Symmetry: C5
Subunit: 311 residues, 5 copies
């Protein structure tokens, strides 16, 4: 089978449409997500045109083998899509209406800079290669683009599934290519982030600040160093949530700042002890007393500065 | 092959039935489970009808290729089902009796709010797309819906496998679709949750309350902070047996409240020490003595309040 | 092709045989094990009978497509077996000698109540569905059931591979089914559980009992709480080695009892300190002295009681 | 189908070209990476020549089955590539222009000696085995070798995708083989390595050096041993971000040196205490005072020496 | 197609040869390794013989379907090999020369008794089942057995790839079977085992022995118990690099002996304290002083005894 011939020098328009049935397995670390969906294609092949009153029937059904079908592919997929043709229907004028149901593991990069308040735009790229006999351009049939209401993605709120209607037509290896961008916008849903990660982590930190109300070097060392170990053990515990990145994250900065707060606390505890042993407890008391307000204030300000920087 | 033509205007009824052979691999985190089962379908195609007298035989066996079979699909499956046709049998009147054996990884959302006492309703959705020549509706043959007695799901009690007899008929991408709901009800079975997770966690907490019978700040700091580390280490240990959710869990609330109890204990220990060093051991003793009854009482009440809230 | 017709009303006997070539990947947590084996089937189809004198040859070889072969399936398999036909050989009387080499991931529940001294019985169920024309029953050819001598399963001792010769014939979805039980008996060979899990766990516990020879509350708190953390860290270390169950295990019970021993030790340490501070060191010394023999004795007895209860 | 016959004794030249569409799943531990690309091949088969006047069309399209296509394979791939033919086009002269799209998990060794500043040269080897009738040699069409601009590999910066134009022609199992080297040059991108791994690790080490300003053996033991535990806990935490190698890494040298610094600190702490108890606090103070500058200086120098040795 | 008939009673000799292209994914815990190789087979089929003079050509190429090919299989493979026929050539006398490229995940038991100094012998078993008409025996063509020079196995040194030339002929299920043993000898390469596992582990143990230079029970308890926790944390860290076995290992024995050394140290610390409190510091000092030389000496000898016992 060969592609349909043109009336004049015009290319062939293929009316695409992706309707999401199921979305699942969003791997934050692999930057992949799986999707089960319909793919509807529609073009006009006049060789397939028929008179309805002579044939008796209003639409003819065909097998994929029987007719010319455009080679549509996905750009950002791991392997070839697991597709099964649902129906092929030709109208009297030759307009083919193809429909298939596929499942694919899609690659879309993620932006963890604002985690756990981050919103993502997942992409699904459709592409078609233009043949020698005639050029092929992709079109969006907005009536055939959507998603089922049950469609969920655990820990996320699925906002919208839309398509960039203007295709990116370009040249590649001496032939024309028509690319389409399907966008799945998702915002993070993590209500339990505060009681499960932030709040227990902050308690550990405030426990260490009780050293500003003690004069026992031995107790203070235990307080500041043990809570530092407890902070690490707490991090080995909630590490699954800790977004695995190579740029600085909002959550990533806070964690770093917390390590600095533990270090500075040790300095104070060491200073207070040294001045006390050097028989100058007047300064040792001044510092400890200052630190009682200095540590919470500097922490609150530094978090305001950060929150501002990231949002 | 084309679908059977109607005598009048009536749609084609397909009598469905799923009989579970083997259930397994329930992934609480992925919200998936795997199932091995039979799928029985039945429809009336009068084109295949035959007189038993002249043919000699009462039932004719066919190959899938030889006859028209409806395109039945699962909605909430990860990839296409691994199906193998068992038998196709046409009765004299043309009533086809299809049977296949399939295996599929099903997506059914889970509700961890009441874990480890949670009960789930696993769904299996059957769907058929109506063709242009004829509309197709799904029906349930209750005599062909069930499960083998050996059918197990480790850590769960399989209660019932039933089907919502009324199909959800709706319009999708300009064509009619008949959807069916098969429900697998399972209640959690975790007897060892108390001795393996709750009881050792509570012992750690009670160890921390021995600080209300000590006046040694150095011993108390060790007691309350070490058991806090031990609580985390215990959590990194039973981290597998922890339900991973983005809403608040019963178990998850307890865990949070336990972190608050550790924090408050530190405050008491710090207060008792400060009042003692500030030469006011009369109130330091009062507080420590109150805490001896205050900490267990508030803990018991708060757990009653929580258990009431979730159940 | 259709099944062979009966001389009388008798059903068709298919002589089964599974010979294990390789056993591997026993997943204690998934309750699965993979196997690579031969499957030999033998029946009598008189339509295939031939005179050896006129034909010249004593046995005729056929292609699966060329002749009727019964639809044999496995019950407890994850997906369809990866089978490849080795040889099909028809004797003069019409007796077919089928042989195929397959590999399958089998599901067989495990009993961890007596771990690490547990022995398991892995099952492989063969099933055949009776057709309309004639009923099919499965038989065991003991000469064709066995296992290679190299057959190993790391973590176990392979005792026997036998078959329950009497098939479980029953009715399902209005048709007869003949089921067969193949049993692979394996006993656990973990001979180093003691030096790797039990002995170090016990050392850590005995270290805590040195608190009965000390009067230093501060040292005792460190001793009993640190070894409690060390017990957890040891458990996060050997947790891969330990069993994953939703009932009570022998190992599980001991672990639980050990947590109780840590709690009781804390009570003693707390009591001894309180009586000493309340200026009553006569009873504080009595208790500590009693505990020196009470803790080991109660431990030995309780382990005898438990070992008896489980075995 | 047989290969095209030579005019004279010249071999057949196949013009290769790999254009990367997607690069992903770089497994540092497995030394593998996955890739999704186009493979364009071009050779001359004069048996396929045609007159565009008689044939009507300027280029004929063929099915893989219909014509002779060279058996091109990848050397360093895990399994066979998941290829799908895009287009086969023959010009009147007999020049075949093949194009397929393949996915493949490629094996290229990695050099972690300079991690996290390491750069890699990933290889993709194309090979063709010469047949008996005529020899086959591989050629590079530089116009058909490249990569899409969106092509990413998380935590790395993709520098270049080039091909060694001269094929490595050699003899293997008595026949000629033409091998081609495609090189993907990447350099590590880990900005957050300093705040997430190095800086918190160093804080923990500096905390241990506060023992040079204390005389309390009990506090010093806690300081040096607790930070040693904290160093390990931190390493179990960042364990993921550590290259798992069987030679010495730049990072692996630093980590080792840090363990030596902890050991030496213990010696000092032990020595200072012994001299103090042996009533010689003049030397004990000298050592502690020296260590205040000795430990940071030796650490800075040793890191300079190392950084120089590795880079 | 049927097998070639014999001139006499002689069996058919098939000349085997495996040439390794790629070796990878050696899973120490699963006892498996993946391999990508050529498989060359050669047998004499006189039915395929041809006079060069009449035929015109010296060698005829065939399709697998066109001629009789022996059913060669691998014994110790997980699933069926992913094979693709490269070339089939028939010389004028009838000598078929088959060549295919395959990939297989092989099963080869490993011996971790001498880890990390262990050397392994990986096996690849070729087998052929004798047919009724003619018996089949396997032969080794040493000119066709080898490995590419780039062939690597990370963390191992590939010594040799040879084949046991004498096949193991035996009877299985009433038919003759010819088995061949291909051996891949690999010796471990773990230079960094000393700085990454042994040396930091010994430093922890050495730290514990500083308790023999202290009289502070409180400091000694911290020293011995904390380093015991640090030993565990270190083990949870390097547990990836420790042989995941059953039977006693060289590394396995050392680790155990180290746990005994921690326990004995506690006894000394406890004894020294008890004698001191019981006002007998003459004996308490003697023991501590003896232990200063007793602990290192007994450790050095016990390791000498061990290494002798294992090597
Ligand atoms: Cl695609
Ligand atoms: Cl489906
Ligand atoms: Cl099966
Ligand atoms: Cl390949
Ligand atoms: Cl094989
Ligand atoms: Na298509
Ligand atoms: Na179907
Ligand atoms: Na302590
Ligand atoms: Na079969
Ligand atoms: Na090819
Ligand atoms: Na500690
Ligand atoms: Na073969």
């Amino acid at each position: 089978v060969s592609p349909p011939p043109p009336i004049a020098d015009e290319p062939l328009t293929v009316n695409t449409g992706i309707y999401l049935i199921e979305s699942y397995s969003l791997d934050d670390k692999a930057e992949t997500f799986k999707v089960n969906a319909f793919l509807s294609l529609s073009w006009k092949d006049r060789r397939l045109a028929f008179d309805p009153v002579r044939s008796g029937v209003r639409v003819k059904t065909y097998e994929p083998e029987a007719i010319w079908i455009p080679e549509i592919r996905f750009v950002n997929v791991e392997n070839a899509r697991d597709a099964d043709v649902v129906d092929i229907s030709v109208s009297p004028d030759g307009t083919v209406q193809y429909l298939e149901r596929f499942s694919a593991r899609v690659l879309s990069p993620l932006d963890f800079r604002r985690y756990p308040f981050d919103s993502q735009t997942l992409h699904i790229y459709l592409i078609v290669r233009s043949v020698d006999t005639r050029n092929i351009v992709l079109a969006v049939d907005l009536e055939k683009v959507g998603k089922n209401d049950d469609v969920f993605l655990t820990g996320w709120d699925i906002e919208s599934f839309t398509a960039v209607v203007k295709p990116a037509n370009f040249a590649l290896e001496d032939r024309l290519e028509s690319k389409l961008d399907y966008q799945l916008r998702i915002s993070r849903q993590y209500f339990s982030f505060i009681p499960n990660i932030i709040l227990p982590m902050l308690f550990i930190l405030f426990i260490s600040w009780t050293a500003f109300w003690s004069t026992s070097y031995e107790a203070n060392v235990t307080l500041v160093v043990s809570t530092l170990i407890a902070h690490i053990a707490f991090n080995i515990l909630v590490e699954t949530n800790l977004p695995k990145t190579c740029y600085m994250t909002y959550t990533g900065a806070i964690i770093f700042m917390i390590y600095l707060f533990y270090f500075v606390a040790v300095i104070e505890v060491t200073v207070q002890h040294y001045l006390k042993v050097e028989s100058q407890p007047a300064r040792a008391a001044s510092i400890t007393r200052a630190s009682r307000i200095a540590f919470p204030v500097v922490f609150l300000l530094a978090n305001i500065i950060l929150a501002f920087l990231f949002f």
